[PDB]
Amino acid sequence: FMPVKLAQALANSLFPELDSQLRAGRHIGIDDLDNHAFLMDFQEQLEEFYARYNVELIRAPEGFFYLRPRSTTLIPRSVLSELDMMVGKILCYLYLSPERLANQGIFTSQELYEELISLADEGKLMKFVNQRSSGSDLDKQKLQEKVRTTLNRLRRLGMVYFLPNNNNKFTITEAVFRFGADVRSGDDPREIQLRMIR
Partner 1 sequence: IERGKFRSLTLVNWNGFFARTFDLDELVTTLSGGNGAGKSTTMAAFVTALIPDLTLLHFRNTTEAGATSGSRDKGLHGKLRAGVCYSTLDVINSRHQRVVVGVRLQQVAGRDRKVDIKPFMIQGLPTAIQPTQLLTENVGERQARVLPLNELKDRLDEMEGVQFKQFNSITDYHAQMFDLGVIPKRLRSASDRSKFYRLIEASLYGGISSAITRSLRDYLLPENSGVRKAFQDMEAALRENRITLE
Partner 2 sequence: SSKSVANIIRKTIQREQNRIRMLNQGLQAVSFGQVRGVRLNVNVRESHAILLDVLSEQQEQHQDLFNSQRLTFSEAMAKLYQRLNPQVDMGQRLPQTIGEELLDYRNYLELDVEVNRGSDGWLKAESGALSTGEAIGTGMSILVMVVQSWEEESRRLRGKDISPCRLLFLDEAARLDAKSIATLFELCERLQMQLIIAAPENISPEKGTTYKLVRKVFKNHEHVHVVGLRGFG
Spatial separation of the C-alpha atoms in residues 21 and 80, rounded to whole Å: 17
Told to check if 10 binds its own copies by CB under 8 A, we report yes
| Residues 61-80 within binding reach of partner 1 (CB under 8 A) | 61, 70
Q: Which of 19, 21, 30, 139 binds partner 1 (CB under 8 A)?
A: 30
Q: Which is nearer to partner 2, 13 or 118 (CB)?
A: 13
Exposure class string for 21-34: b at 16+ Cβ within 10 A, else e: bbeebbbbbeebee
Residue 139 contact partner, candidates partner 1, partner 2, its own copies, none, CB within 5 to 8 A by sort of partner: none
The residues, ordered by sequence, that sit 6+ positions from 154 with a Cβ below 8 Å of its Cβ are 84, 87, 88, 91, 160
Q: Which residues bind partner 2 (CB under 8 A)?
A: 8, 11-14, 31-35, 37-38, 41, 105, 161, 163, 171, 173, 185
Q: Which stretch binds partner 1 (CB under 8 A): 9-17, 55-63, 96-104, 131-139?
A: 55-63
Strand partners, 162: 170
Radius of gyration of the chain (CA): 19
Give the DSSP per-residue string, 98-136: THHHHHTT-EEHHHHHHHHHHHS-HHHHHHHH-TT--S-
Q: Contact with its own copies (CB under 8 A): which of 14, 20, 37, 110?
A: 20
- State which H helix or E strand residue 6 sits in: helix 4-11
Quick check: 16 binds its own copies (CB under 8 A)? yes
Binding site for partner 1 (CB under 8 A): 3, 30, 33, 36-37, 40, 47-48, 51, 56-59, 61, 70, 178, 180-183
Binding residues vs its own copies (CB under 8 A): 1-2, 4, 7-8, 10-11, 16-17, 20, 24, 52-53, 74-76
